Design a protein around this ligand. Structure first.
Ligand SMILES: COc1ccc([C@H](NC(=O)c2ncnc3[nH]ccc23)[C@H](C)c2nnn[nH]2)cc1
Length: 166
C-alpha cells in the first residue's frame, strides 16, 4: 500500500491523476476495485485495462465465478484474486443510469468499499454508465468510511474534481 503523490480530500478519501493499472503495478495494494458489470465481462474502460494487464487471467477466473454463482446485482460486488496487480480485486457494479438503472444504487455500490480497510479504486458509474463524475465523487465521500485512494486517468476530469471539491 505504498501510495505516493495523492492529494487528501477528506480524512479517508485521497485522489491522484494516474492510470489505475500503473498504480496497481507500483503499489501492489491489498485491494484494487474494478468498475464491473453484472456478468463480469471486462470489455473496456477500467475493466478492460485491468484484465489486459493480467493477460486475460482475470477474465478466465471471472467466467468461472459466473458459472458457479450467477451474475452480480446492480449495487453489489464480489471479491476475486488480484492476480499480479493486487492481493484481491473487488468487482463492483454501479448503476448504468443511461439504461434506466436507479442512481440511488450508486450509494449501495460504494458501500461495498467499507468491507476493506484500504482500497485503490476508480470513480463508479462515470463514462458510458452516464452518472456525472463530480456527483459520483460526492457519493463516494459521503458513503465510504475506510481509506480509499482514487486514481483518475483524465487530467481534465482530475482538475474539475479538485476544483469542485476543495
Ligand atoms: C462504467 O464505469 C466507468 C467508471 C470509470 C470510468 C472512467 N475511468 C477510467 O476509464 C479509468 N480510470 C482510471 N484508470 C484507468 N485506466 C484505464 C482506464 C481508466 C472515468 C470517466 C475516468 N476518467 N478518468 N478517470 N476516471 C468510465 C466508466
Amino acid at each position: 500500500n505504498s501510495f505516493s503523490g495523492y492529494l487528501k480530500l477528506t480524512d479517508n478519501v485521497y485522489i491522484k491523476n494516474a492510470d489505475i493499472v500503473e498504480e496497481a503495478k507500483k503499489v501492489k495494494p491489498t485491494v484494487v476495485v474494478n468498475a464491473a458489470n453484472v456478468y463480469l465481462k471486462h470489455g473496456g474502460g477500467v475493466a478492460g485495462a485491468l484484465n489486459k494487464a493480467t493477460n486475460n487471467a482475470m477474465q478466465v477466473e471471472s467466467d468461472d465465478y459466473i458459472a458457479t454463482n450467477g451474475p452480480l446485482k446492480v449495487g453489489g460486488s464480489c471479491v476475486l484474486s488480484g492476480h499480479n496487480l493486487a492481493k484481491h480485486c473487488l468487482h463492483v457494479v454501479g448503476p448504468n443510469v443511461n439504461k434506466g438503472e436507479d442512481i440511488q444504487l450508486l450509494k449501495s455500490a460504494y458501500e461495498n468499499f467499507n468491507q476493506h480497510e484500504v482500497l485503490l479504486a476508480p470513480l463508479l458509474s462515470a463514462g458510458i454508465f452516464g452518472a456525472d463524475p463530480i456527483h459520483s465523487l460526492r457519493v463516494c465521500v459521503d458513503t465510504v468510511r475506510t481509506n480509499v485512494y482514487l486514481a483518475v486517468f483524465d487530467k481534465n476530469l482530475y482538475d474539475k474534481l479538485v476544483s469542485s471539491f476543495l
